[PDB]
Amino acid sequence: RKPKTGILMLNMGGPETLGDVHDFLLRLFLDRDLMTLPIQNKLAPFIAKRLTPKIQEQYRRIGGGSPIKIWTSKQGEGMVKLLDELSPNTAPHKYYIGFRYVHPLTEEAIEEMERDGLERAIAFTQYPQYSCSTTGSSLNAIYRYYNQVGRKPTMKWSTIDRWPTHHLLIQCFADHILKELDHFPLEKRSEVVILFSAHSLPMSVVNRGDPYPQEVSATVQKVMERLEYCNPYRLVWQSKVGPMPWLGPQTDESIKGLCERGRKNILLVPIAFTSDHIETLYELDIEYSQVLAKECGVENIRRAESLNGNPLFSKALADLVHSHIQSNELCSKQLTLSCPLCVNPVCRETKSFFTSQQL
Amino acid sequence: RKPKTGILMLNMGGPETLGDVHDFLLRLFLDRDLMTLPIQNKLAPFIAKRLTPKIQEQYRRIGGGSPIKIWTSKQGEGMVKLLDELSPNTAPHKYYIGFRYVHPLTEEAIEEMERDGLERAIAFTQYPQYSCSTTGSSLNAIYRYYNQVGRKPTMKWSTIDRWPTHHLLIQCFADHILKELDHFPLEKRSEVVILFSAHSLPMSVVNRGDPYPQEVSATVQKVMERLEYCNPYRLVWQSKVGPMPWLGPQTDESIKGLCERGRKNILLVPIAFTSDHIETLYELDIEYSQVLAKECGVENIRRAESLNGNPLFSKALADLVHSHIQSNELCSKQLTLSCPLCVNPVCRETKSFFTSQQL
Numbered sequence: 001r002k003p004k005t006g007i008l009m010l011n012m013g014g015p016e017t018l019g020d021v022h023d024f025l026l027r028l029f030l031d032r033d034l035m036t037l038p039i040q041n042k043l044a045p046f047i048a049k050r051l052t053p054k055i056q057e058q059y060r061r062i063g064g065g066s067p068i069k070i071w072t073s074k075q076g077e078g079m080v081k082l083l084d085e086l087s088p089n090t091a092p093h094k095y096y097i098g099f100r101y102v103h104p105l106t107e108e109a110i111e112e113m114e115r116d117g118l119e120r121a122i123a124f125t126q127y128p129q130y131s132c133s134t135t136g137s138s139l140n141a142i143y144r145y146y147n148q149v150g151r152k153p154t155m156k157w158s159t160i161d162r163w164p165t166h167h168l169l170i171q172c173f174a175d176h177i178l179k180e181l182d183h184f185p186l187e188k189r190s191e192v193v194i195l196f197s198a199h200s201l202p203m204s205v206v207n208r209g210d211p212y213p214q215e216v217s218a219t220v221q222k223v224m225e226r227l228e229y230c231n232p233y234r235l236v237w238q239s240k241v242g243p244m245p246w247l248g249p250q251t252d253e254s255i256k257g258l259c260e261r262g263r264k265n266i267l268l269v270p271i272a273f274t275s276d277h278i279e280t281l282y283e284l285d286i287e288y289s290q291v292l293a294k295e296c297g298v299e300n301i302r303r304a305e306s307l308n309g310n311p312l313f314s315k316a317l318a319d320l321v322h323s324h325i326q327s328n329e330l331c332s333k334q335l336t337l338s339c340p341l342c343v344n345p346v347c348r349e350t351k352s353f354f355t356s357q358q359l
Numbered sequence: 360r361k362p363k364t365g366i367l368m369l370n371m372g373g374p375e376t377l378g379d380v381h382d383f384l385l386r387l388f389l390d391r392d393l394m395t396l397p398i399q400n401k402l403a404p405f406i407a408k409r410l411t412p413k414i415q416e417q418y419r420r421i422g423g424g425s426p427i428k429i430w431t432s433k434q435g436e437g438m439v440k441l442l443d444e445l446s447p448n449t450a451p452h453k454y455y456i457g458f459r460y461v462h463p464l465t466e467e468a469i470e471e472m473e474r475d476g477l478e479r480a481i482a483f484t485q486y487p488q489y490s491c492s493t494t495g496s497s498l499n500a501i502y503r504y505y506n507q508v509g510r511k512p513t514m515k516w517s518t519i520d521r522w523p524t525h526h527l528l529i530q531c532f533a534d535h536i537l538k539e540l541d542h543f544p545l546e547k548r549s550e551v552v553i554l555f556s557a558h559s560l561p562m563s564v565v566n567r568g569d570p571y572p573q574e575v576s577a578t579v580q581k582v583m584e585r586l587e588y589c590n591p592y593r594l595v596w597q598s599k600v601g602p603m604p605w606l607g608p609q610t611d612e613s614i615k616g617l618c619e620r621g622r623k624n625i626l627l628v629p630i631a632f633t634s635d636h637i638e639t640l641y642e643l644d645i646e647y648s649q650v651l652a653k654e655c656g657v658e659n660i661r662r663a664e665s666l667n668g669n670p671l672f673s674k675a676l677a678d679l680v681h682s683h684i685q686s687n688e689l690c691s692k693q694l695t696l697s698c699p700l701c702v703n704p705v706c707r708e709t710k711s712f713f714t715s716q717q718l
């Protein structure tokens with residue numbers, strides 16, 4: 001039986017091997033919906049080349065590459081299995097991976113979906129909280145693909161552009177937090193302080209109206225409510241780079257600050273991504289938990305396991321797609337409102353691309 | 360007959376008459392928990408004096424004074440009426456107003472509570488979302504009062520230091536939003552965009568770990584979920600002053616940005632305060648809705664009514680106090696975690712003041 005419904009799982013992606021690092025960075029630095037550089041066509045390949053060594057080294061430190069594709073595939077397989085049972089009327093379902101900067105690229109996925117002659121296509125962002133820089137960028141790629149190929153889609157499109165508080169997503173986070181709290185010495189469990197950590201954004205992006213911070217904040221509240229506020233927490237942000245102002249507090253500075261103030265039992269909780277990747281395996285685990293934490297004299301610092309292959313997470317994914325199909329939703333109401341200070345003309349085109357879809 | 364349980368309603372307060380502006384500002388610039396200034400004892404009176412004219416003018420523009428005490432009193436009376444019926448075991452209940460910078464001052468309220476021979480005293484912040492600059496400052500005042508008076512309290516203390524997602528608070532906001540949406544022309548109701556607006560914070564405060572942004576964001580999500588995402592929204596921030604970086608987007612820039620982008624039907628929703636005051640009556644209503652909006656060519660801009668005298672809000676207050684009493688809570692779990700980068704030694708003292716209370 002030929003595939004009827006395709007679920008395009010969108011994510012930035014990460015290099016699978018050290019050899020993929022260079023092109024990963026190149027594609028990224030060439031992206032306008034994310035970055036404007038002078039003589040970009042020249043500096044893009046240059047900056048990619050100069051950062052490759054350091055980035056390859058980071059991936060070497062975690063085993064030689066990014067596990068994003070492996071986890072995405074496992075989740076997609078689980079999701080599809082459930083969807084075929086949940087929604088027989090839209091089966092067979094097939095998942096496609098559309099990474100923004102690595103293979104399979106968004107464009108390659110769309111080309112295959114079209115080639116497979118699907119009746120329906122769902123742009124399912126793998127980022128629970130919407131940022132014009134993450135989900136937005138992936139959605140722009142879809143609009144741009146058809147605009148560039150100079151032809152209309154042969155499939156009916158729609159998008160699940162955000163899902164910051166999906167009940168099953170929240171349950172997964174809560175479950176992983178609880179099981180990690182169990183790993184702390186019993187005598188320190190109640191003393192543990194939780195630092196929810198999400199990739200930060202430059203203040204210039206936050207100030208334009210990016211939906212991200214508020215949604216990430218919503219996820220945190222939902223998780224803590226489910227945990228019945230068993231431990232105190234703080235939502236902090238990681239991955240800042242460069243000298244420019246970014247949304248803080250910074251995860252690293254917070255870890256150090258807590259230790260200096262007597263809170264030496266910390267539980268890190270990646271709250272804005274669903275699989276392991278450089279942010280968790282390198283930045284949180286090595287950079288902060290092994291090096292920084294040791295230098296600050298932490299007693300116990302752990303990190304909640306990433307959702308990865310948790311069966312309940314695959315259930316969450318299937319539930320989202322199923323509910324989306326049943327509601328005939330073309331996109332969230334939120335997507336119909338671009339940032340108040342958006343200056344990228346493509347955002348409105350992308351929005352319209354989805355709001356105007358037939359069906 | 361004699362009062363048994365006192366509910367101290369904490370809020371910054373506002374000058375009741377133009378004549379009260381000067382001392383309001385003086386007390387404020389003399390608060391080390393709010394800000395630290397060089398030679399503060401000399402600069403406070405000086406700054407208060409220089410700002411008085413402009414601030415008096417703002418209050419003149421809204422009628423001649425702040426309605427905060429009037430609304431606070433009405434809510435307090437309604438709250439007490441309900442509490443006497445809800446919690447007979449802790450009745451008679453008495454509410455006391457503890458304004459940070461205007462009469463009745465926090466210190467004056469405490470003196471009266473002590474004098475009334477209360478058995479229980481509850482520091483009930485009127486800010487649903489915790490900021491060390493709002494609720495924290497108020498709680499610090501309580502600790503400082505006893506530390507300064509050189510005497511221990513004669514009543515049992517506890518605090519309701521935050522309540523960002525209390526179901527009745529959320530219902531009130533949603534109700535007021537729905538009725539304001541009904542005031543827009545029917546043909547534009549669906550086109551209306553919601554701007555949740557809350558007093559901004561300097562990035563220096565946000566970056567040290569202030570709980571505020573994340574909690575305000577939680578309130579927004581709960582309200583939108585209750586409204587079933589009927590309209591698109593954005594959480595923006597108002598009241599920024601000075602040349603330093605503050606958390607954006609700015610409410611004023613967002614209003615202008617939306618209009619320039621074709622979204623000329625806006626609903627402003629104060630989401631971090633429960634009564635009318637300078638932020639709503641002047642900043643939003645006059646500064647932004649009457650002047651700015653007009654200059655931007657807005658079609659319709661309205662503001663959800665503040666909670667003020669809504670009976671359901673008095674119920675929310677009573678329910679919070681009731682649940683607090685029945686739970687025997689001394690404070691939220693959140694108060695037990697000071698900011699990761701807190702540099703104010705009084706914060707820990709204040710925290711301990713409550714966590715260490717007998718009972």
Ligand SMILES: C[C@H](CCC(=O)O)[C@H]1CC[C@H]2[C@@H]3[C@H](O)C[C@@H]4C[C@H](O)CC[C@]4(C)[C@H]3C[C@H](O)[C@]12C
Nearest residue numbers: 035036037038039040043044046047048050244
């Ligand atoms: C100016 C521009 C940022 C523009 C902006 O966002 O306003 C920045 C982004 C990355 C920068 C480049 C990268 O840092 C790589 C190089 C760093 C060297 O120190 C200067 C040249 C160098 C090639 C930089 C030139 C310039 O300062 C760039 C291109």
Ligand SMILES: C[C@H](CCC(=O)O)[C@H]1CC[C@H]2[C@@H]3[C@H](O)C[C@@H]4C[C@H](O)CC[C@]4(C)[C@H]3C[C@H](O)[C@]12C
Nearest residue numbers: 028034131132133134200201202205206239241
């Ligand atoms: C800052 C920007 C998001 C901006 C926005 O909020 O719109 C994010 C998106 C992808 C990020 C980049 C990618 O993760 C790839 C690189 C990862 C390195 O660890 C830092 C540089 C690096 C080049 C990152 C810089 C920055 O954090 C980027 C560019």
Ligand SMILES: C[C@H](CCC(=O)O)[C@H]1CC[C@H]2[C@@H]3[C@H](O)C[C@@H]4C[C@H](O)CC[C@]4(C)[C@H]3C[C@H](O)[C@]12C
Nearest residue numbers: 034035036047050051202204241242243244245
């Ligand atoms: C750190 C890295 C340059 C590394 C190098 O010179 O080797 C530079 C290259 C392009 C930069 C990014 C681009 O200038 C686009 C964004 C500009 C904002 O002011 C900060 C975030 C922002 C996302 C920058 C983050 C960071 O400074 C980047 C990623």
Ligand SMILES: C[C@H](CCC(=O)O)[C@H]1CC[C@H]2[C@@H]3[C@H](O)C[C@@H]4C[C@H](O)CC[C@]4(C)[C@H]3C[C@H](O)[C@]12C
Nearest residue numbers: 394395396397398399402405406409563601603
């Ligand atoms: C330097 C200090 C801020 C210190 C800090 O945050 O680290 C700021 C806070 C308020 C400022 C003062 C207030 O703005 C009032 C005055 C404004 C005048 O333009 C300069 C003198 C003036 C008296 C300022 C001096 C100085 O710049 C102050 C005292």
Ligand SMILES: C[C@H](CCC(=O)O)[C@H]1CC[C@H]2[C@@H]3[C@H](O)C[C@@H]4C[C@H](O)CC[C@]4(C)[C@H]3C[C@H](O)[C@]12C
Nearest residue numbers: 387393490491492559560561564565598599600
């Ligand atoms: C910025 C600060 C909160 C700081 C923090 O996040 O810790 C808030 C608390 C009370 C505010 C002040 C009070 O509202 C009184 C004044 C109101 C005027 O409209 C601006 C100046 C004014 C003097 C305000 C400046 C600033 O917005 C203050 C000082």
Ligand SMILES: C[C@H](CCC(=O)O)[C@H]1CC[C@H]2[C@@H]3[C@H](O)C[C@@H]4C[C@H](O)CC[C@]4(C)[C@H]3C[C@H](O)[C@]12C
Nearest residue numbers: 393394395396406409410561563600601602603
């Ligand atoms: C604007 C006002 C001075 C007005 C005047 O003298 O004309 C100054 C006096 C003290 C200032 C505040 C204090 O310096 C404390 C805070 C310092 C932060 O860098 C900005 C917020 C912050 C809360 C300042 C806001 C604003 O710039 C204030 C309130």
Ligand code: FES
Nearest residue numbers: 132338339342347
């Ligand atoms: S930058 Fe957010 S919609 Fe364009």
Ligand code: FES
Nearest residue numbers: 491697698701706
């Ligand atoms: S400044 Fe937040 S706890 Fe001290």
